[PDB]
Amino acid sequence: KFPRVKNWELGSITYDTLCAQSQQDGPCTPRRCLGSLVLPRKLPAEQLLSQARDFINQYYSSIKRSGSQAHEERLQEVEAEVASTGTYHLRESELVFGAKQAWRNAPRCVGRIQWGKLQVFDARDCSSAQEMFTYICNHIKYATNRGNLRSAITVFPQRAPGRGDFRIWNSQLVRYAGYRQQDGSVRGDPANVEITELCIQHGWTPGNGRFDVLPLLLQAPDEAPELFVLPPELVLEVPLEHPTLEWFAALGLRWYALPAVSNMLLEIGGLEFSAAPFSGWYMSTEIGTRNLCDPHRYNILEDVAVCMDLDTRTTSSLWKDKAAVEINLAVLHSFQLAKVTIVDHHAATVSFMKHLDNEQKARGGCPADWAWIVPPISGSLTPVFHQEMVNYILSPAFRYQPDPW
Amino acid sequence: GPKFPRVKNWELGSITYDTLCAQSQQDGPCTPRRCLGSLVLPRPAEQLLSQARDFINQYYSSIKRSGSQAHEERLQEVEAEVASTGTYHLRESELVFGAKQAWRNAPRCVGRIQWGKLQVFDARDCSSAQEMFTYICNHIKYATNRGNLRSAITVFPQRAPGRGDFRIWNSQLVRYAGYRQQDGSVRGDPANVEITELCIQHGWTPGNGRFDVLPLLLQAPDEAPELFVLPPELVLEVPLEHPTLEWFAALGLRWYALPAVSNMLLEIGGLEFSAAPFSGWYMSTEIGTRNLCDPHRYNILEDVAVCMDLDTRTTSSLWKDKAAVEINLAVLHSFQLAKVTIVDHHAATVSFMKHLDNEQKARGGCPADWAWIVPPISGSLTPVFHQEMVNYILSPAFRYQPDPW
Numbered sequence: 001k002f003p004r005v006k007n008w009e010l011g012s013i014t015y016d017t018l019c020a021q022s023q024q025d026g027p028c029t030p031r032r033c034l035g036s037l038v039l040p041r042k043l044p045a046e047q048l049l050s051q052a053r054d055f056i057n058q059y060y061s062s063i064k065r066s067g068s069q070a071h072e073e074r075l076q077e078v079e080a081e082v083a084s085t086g087t088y089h090l091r092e093s094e095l096v097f098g099a100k101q102a103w104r105n106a107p108r109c110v111g112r113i114q115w116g117k118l119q120v121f122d123a124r125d126c127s128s129a130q131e132m133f134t135y136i137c138n139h140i141k142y143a144t145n146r147g148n149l150r151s152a153i154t155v156f157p158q159r160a161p162g163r164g165d166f167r168i169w170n171s172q173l174v175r176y177a178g179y180r181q182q183d184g185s186v187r188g189d190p191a192n193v194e195i196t197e198l199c200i201q202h203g204w205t206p207g208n209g210r211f212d213v214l215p216l217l218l219q220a221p222d223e224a225p226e227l228f229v230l231p232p233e234l235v236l237e238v239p240l241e242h243p244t245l246e247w248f249a250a251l252g253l254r255w256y257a258l259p260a261v262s263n264m265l266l267e268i269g270g271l272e273f274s275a276a277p278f279s280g281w282y283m284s285t286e287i288g289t290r291n292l293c294d295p296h297r298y299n300i301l302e303d304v305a306v307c308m309d310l311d312t313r314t315t316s317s318l319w320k321d322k323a324a325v326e327i328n329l330a331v332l333h334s335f336q337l338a339k340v341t342i343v344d345h346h347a348a349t350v351s352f353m354k355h356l357d358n359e360q361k362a363r364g365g366c367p368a369d370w371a372w373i374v375p376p377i378s379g380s381l382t383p384v385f386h387q388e389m390v391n392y393i394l395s396p397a398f399r400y401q402p403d404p405w
Numbered sequence: 406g407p408k409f410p411r412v413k414n415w416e417l418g419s420i421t422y423d424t425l426c427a428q429s430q431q432d433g434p435c436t437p438r439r440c441l442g443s444l445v446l447p448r449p450a451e452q453l454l455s456q457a458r459d460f461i462n463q464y465y466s467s468i469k470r471s472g473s474q475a476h477e478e479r480l481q482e483v484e485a486e487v488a489s490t491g492t493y494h495l496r497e498s499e500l501v502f503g504a505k506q507a508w509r510n511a512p513r514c515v516g517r518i519q520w521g522k523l524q525v526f527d528a529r530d531c532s533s534a535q536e537m538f539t540y541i542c543n544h545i546k547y548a549t550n551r552g553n554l555r556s557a558i559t560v561f562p563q564r565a566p567g568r569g570d571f572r573i574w575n576s577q578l579v580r581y582a583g584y585r586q587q588d589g590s591v592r593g594d595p596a597n598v599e600i601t602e603l604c605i606q607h608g609w610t611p612g613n614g615r616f617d618v619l620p621l622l623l624q625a626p627d628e629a630p631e632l633f634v635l636p637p638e639l640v641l642e643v644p645l646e647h648p649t650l651e652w653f654a655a656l657g658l659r660w661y662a663l664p665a666v667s668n669m670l671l672e673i674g675g676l677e678f679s680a681a682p683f684s685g686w687y688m689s690t691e692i693g694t695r696n697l698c699d700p701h702r703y704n705i706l707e708d709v710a711v712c713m714d715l716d717t718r719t720t721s722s723l724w725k726d727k728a729a730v731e732i733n734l735a736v737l738h739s740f741q742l743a744k745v746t747i748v749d750h751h752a753a754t755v756s757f758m759k760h761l762d763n764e765q766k767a768r769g770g771c772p773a774d775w776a777w778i779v780p781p782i783s784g785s786l787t788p789v790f791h792q793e794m795v796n797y798i799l800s801p802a803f804r805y806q807p808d809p810w
């Protein structure tokens with residue numbers, strides 16, 4: 001049954017027919033909804049072949065040439081390759097199309113209005129961790145573009161049956177070290193304690209600051225990962241200050257410009273790309289609310305509240321809310337002043353509503369994960385709160401994969 | 406490991422498995438292919454007897470007498486009653502147990518820590534619209550208790566073979582009118598436009614303010630509903646003021662004290678109580694964020710922001726967020742000053758986390774609808790954001806039911 005999807009602010013209704021194209025089960029059943037789970041529980045040539053055919057069909061339909069010579073000859077090449085070898089290879093233009101489609105299909109992404117504007121670097125000719133690093137540096141330099149951020153992805157060689165994966169061990173290309181104490185507390189970013197510890201153990205000389213940028217651990221197939229320090233000139237950061245509260249800069253807070261996620265698997269036509277780091281730009285709430293105010297991240301709410309002289313002794317003063325707002329304001333202000341691309345959660349959700357509408361017209365639906373699309377402050381103040389959404393898995397897709405250690 | 410959903414808290418790192426969901430006998434709207442958890446309203450002799458036997462089994466476990474001789478004699482009496490009459494009837498203590506359990510089972514209610522403290526008024530002897538009114542007045546008086554609110558439900562007679570239902574037409578016992586204007590806008594609460602116009606069709610003389618309390622339309626079996634005006638002294642209201650912004654009082658905003666929901670069906674052991682109004686107290690975001698700030702509700706955000714002198718011409722000022730926070734603060738401050746029970750969103754979510762722990766031990770789980778439990782401002786600042794939840798239907802249950810017209 002095709003779901004009816006209602007917007008409760010406007011009264012409008014659509015029907016999602018794209019979901020019938022899903023060949024891939026999520027975590028829910030009629031007995032119970034597991035839509036709030038962050039990760040999946042779990043984490044043959046005929047099956048590869050049908051995923052391949054389907055993807056090649058998606059590709060040819062996208063260039064309008066769907067039935068042509070070229071199309072039927074490509075299907076046969078894929079077929080011949082699979083049958084003889086158990087696997088196949090994409091053409092670069094197919095890869096480019098598949099990478100954009102993976103982004104488009106990602107239900108947790110509120111930035112998808114931008115899905116067609118993606119620079120794709122083909123790095124499938126990579127044979128060593130040293131070469132990975134070179135490609136990574138060019139990606140960063142390109143994507144960063146002195147603050148005028150440009151969306152990008154770099155695709156390293158696919159998984160192959162007989163061998164280890166290319167992997168980037170770090171979860172993003174820029175991460176701040178998290179240093180555990182003998183007394184259990186963390187200095188820096190508690191989300192990165194484990195990667196920090198792996199880095200030291202592979203020979204990194206640690207720092208002891210709150211915002212020490214980590215080296216990368218890059219792994220070529222079946223080899224120990226190697227360590228590469230990013231040149232500081234490549235890592236653009238933004239000092240945080242507040243437009244009217246002058247002590248705020250005194251807090252010594254900063255964040256990096258480029259969100260470049262480096263641990264997700266890209267799946268295109270049944271092929272799997274274990275190292276395919278991608279980047280866009282930040283939505284301010286990711287920094288201002290989560291990364292700075294999460295209790296298990298930098299957890300700065302209390303410090304900010306005290307500096308604002310708020311009554312911290314009682315939840316009902318809404319001290320937490322008030323301090324969060326000002327931190328988000330600082331991030332927006334500081335990024336604007338530094339001429340580094342960023343989008344606020346109001347503008348982002350308004351763009352995503354436009355996206356839903358474009359996708360309704362173009363494909364009869366849009367898979368979206370409401371819990372992830374609605375921002376972590378001011379939820380009901382954004383239009384996406386009032387929008388019903390259908391979550392399902394289309395391919396090409398970005399997926400999670402096991403940590404390689 | 407365990408063959409049951411694994412549930413993680415990402416703030417604390419802790420894991421539980423929900424075994425309770427095994428007890429669900431009713432499908433929700435999700436399938437492996439697509440998740441529909443964000444939809445608001447997704448769309449009998451042996452059947453009754455099986456629901457009835459299960460509910461009686463639940464009652465007998467709750468008083469620890471399962472397999473007892475009184476347990477088996479009650480089961481026989483329910484078979485016999487259904488046998489000869491097509492239906493059966495609950496003992497008083499079974500109704501009290503069922504009502505509390507429907508509350509405990511409600512996945513969308515963040516206030517469930519209070520589930521065992523529910524006063525159950527048995528109004529199953531009611532035989533007229535006028536008597537419903539008296540019962541409802543008494544409910545309102547007991548529950549309001551001059552500001553020190555007490556949770557309560559009043560249960561009118563069950564649906565019965567052939568005979569018409571008891572219904573309260575109004576969605577809550579207190580509703581402000583919504584008067585559709587010539588210019589297409591609404592004075593009052595836009596949520597209540599259809600109920601307002603029903604009231605006037607049924608002979609109410611409408612006012613023209615923004616906070617006109619509506620009459621009730623009450624319907625006894627096989628009759629036209631009858632209109633009843635609540636005496637104003639029974640309807641406690643709280644004028645909104647802000648603790649430091651002295652002009653806020655001048656806006657003339659107010660809200661009523663008692664959230665008393667009146668259009669839900671209470672289902673117990675396959676019996677159906679079509680009128681069973683219940684009340685608790687408010688969480689402050691219901692008033693300050695949704696009712697006052699939804700665009701399709703009082704929509705006051707821009708007005709408040711202009712009084713605060715914010716820059717409303719750009720999203721990135723965070724004007725909506727700053728206004729909403731102040732409006733929520735005024736709600737909390739005003740209810741406090743007036744001594745009317747209210748709970749803020751931090752204290753409510755903290756208590757709900759306690760609830761989850763209590764239910765993990767008492768029954769192996771707790772059905773919860775993450776999108777509804779997480780408050781509409783300051784989401785990730787509350788501990789429930791970071792908590793995975795499993796949503797499923799257990800009975801006894803409160804259910805939506807179609808409007809009586």
Ligand code: HEM
Pocket residue numbers: 099103106108109110111112114118151152153278279280281282283286343348372398
């Ligand atoms: C151009 C600006 C972009 C913005 C503002 C943006 C925004 C976001 C946000 C806010 C999230 C949620 C992140 C979190 O809470 O952890 C997200 C998730 C994601 N976005 Fe984007 N996006 C952008 C570009 C991209 C690009 C370039 C890709 C891939 C090519 C992408 C793929 C994803 C994926 C796969 C997720 C899910 C991540 C996960 O499950 O952990 N987005 N997006």
Ligand code: HEM
Pocket residue numbers: 508511513514515516517519523556557558683684685686687688691748753777803
């Ligand atoms: C004691 C104080 C209580 C608090 C603070 C409270 C809080 C809430 C809130 C905030 C919601 C969501 C409402 C909305 O967003 O529309 C809710 C939903 C609900 N609560 Fe409560 N609750 C309380 C008591 C009650 C009681 C006494 C009952 C029944 C006996 C109840 C049953 C429900 C149900 C059925 C819903 C779901 C409503 C729907 O689907 O529209 N709760 N609760």
Ligand SMILES: Nc1ccc2ccc(CNCCc3cccc(F)c3)cc2n1
Pocket residue numbers: 038039111259261279280281282283286
């Ligand atoms: N601005 C952007 C754009 C794309 C992004 C893609 C992914 C991410 C990060 N999401 C990680 C979510 C997560 C954190 C920790 C554990 C986990 F399973 C999942 C952030 C993004 N931000």
Ligand SMILES: Nc1ccc2ccc(CNCCc3cccc(F)c3)cc2n1
Pocket residue numbers: 445446516664666684685686687688691
């Ligand atoms: N504080 C309380 C306690 C119990 C409540 C029980 C129910 C409600 C109202 N929720 C109605 C949600 C709703 C609005 C509009 C359409 C719809 F289907 C559902 C509010 C409550 N607030």
Ligand SMILES: C[C@H](O)[C@H](O)[C@H]1CNc2nc(N)[nH]c(=O)c2N1
Pocket residue numbers: 036037038371372373415790791792793794
């Ligand atoms: C448990 C819950 O699903 C989890 O905390 C999710 C909620 N929504 C989110 N939304 C975004 N955008 N990013 C997140 O990490 C999460 N976390």
Ligand SMILES: C[C@H](O)[C@H](O)[C@H]1CNc2nc(N)[nH]c(=O)c2N1
Pocket residue numbers: 008385386387388389443444445776777778
């Ligand atoms: C589309 C979405 O499900 C809808 O707006 C929901 C989201 N969460 C909610 N949560 C609560 N508590 N109350 C609501 O009305 C809603 N609305």
Ligand SMILES: [Zn+2]
Pocket residue numbers: 028032033034035435439440441442
């Ligand atoms: Zn689901």
